[PDB]
Symmetry: C2
Subunit: 219 residues, 2 copies
Amino acid sequence: NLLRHLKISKEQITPVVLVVGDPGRVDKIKVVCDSYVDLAYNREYKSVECHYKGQKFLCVSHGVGCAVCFEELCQNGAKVIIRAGSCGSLQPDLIKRGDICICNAAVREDRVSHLLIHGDFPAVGDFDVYDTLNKCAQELNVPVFNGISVSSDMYSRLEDYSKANAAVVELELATLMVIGTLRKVKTGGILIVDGCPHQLENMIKIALGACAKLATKYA
Amino acid sequence: NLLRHLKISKEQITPVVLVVGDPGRVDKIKVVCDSYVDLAYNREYKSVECHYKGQKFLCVSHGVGSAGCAVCFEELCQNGAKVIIRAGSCGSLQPDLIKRGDICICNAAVREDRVSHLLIHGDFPAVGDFDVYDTLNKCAQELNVPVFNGISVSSDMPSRLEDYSKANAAVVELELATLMVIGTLRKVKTGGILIVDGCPPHQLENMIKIALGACAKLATKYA
């Protein structure tokens, strides 16, 4: 009565799930919550039940593998999924190392989404997830950018997309969005800037706050 | 000091603009407004200043069958438009759920359109502004009008449409993907609202009301 790559029960899977990269970043989030319960740890896939602002939701990692992670979650009960992680600025003059970006859509430069549907199909997140993230960030008077991510599975064309007004670049958000849209799962992403080809805690607060706010509607 | 394909002044171009297909549908919107002023008429391009709920914004047509929409959107984005909304018709790709007569507010589109691909690689999303989408939904609910939300297939016409339909695309029409991308390239906020034709009446007035209402609401933030 368990799942393959996550090693947790379908019973344990919450409506809202928060997905991150490094499994250590999951350990850094559980502590910040009101309370938590560890569920499992499997090669690269850590899963913890997070209790925060009255609500209960999973936080789960998969490595710095994401496709199968998102697949598994969408199959087995996730209604909302949010990715929090890092990215690169594609607007160096405006968006600077340390800035936070909430993304509503992405450029499909990713192997996996193209295996599932023709590239013309938009990688786009849920509105109410995007709204919820913005309102938490403003409620905590934290300035945040909004824009489009280039989801690219290596990192060029990045110049093109940058001058097409893409904000940031990361690996997997386009994958989540499409899987989400295919599986009727609401998705979003929030990202903090690394390179450019304290703030982290605020982002996590936005992410956690948003998750709690969304979790309300399924409890 | 006036523009090429639209035949109106850059001074006359408002922050918010409403774009429709058939120029007869512009005549059907005039009536619904509080007041209006005609600006110009050029082969297929009718342009009217619309006054509604205290605000002033352009309404413009450009033809059926994806005529010269690209140049229309280009012209508007070049010369001051900050928000652009497309109202028009479409086909249901979810026959059991979405029926002839239903209204759909779209947040994104499938790029099956010649023109967007000439401008940026197909991987780039055709996606609307979320505040425009929010504003349309709230007008439709404020007027207790039920509306669908979903993705449009913007197509210039074999049965990829099956694929997209089972990928949960809601409707199909001609040019919304084009607007969104031009919008995103030119830093102009876009959105779209559509009424169903047929798969494979009164309601039109509600849609126009949503469109007009949303435009007014957005126009506030620039006036």
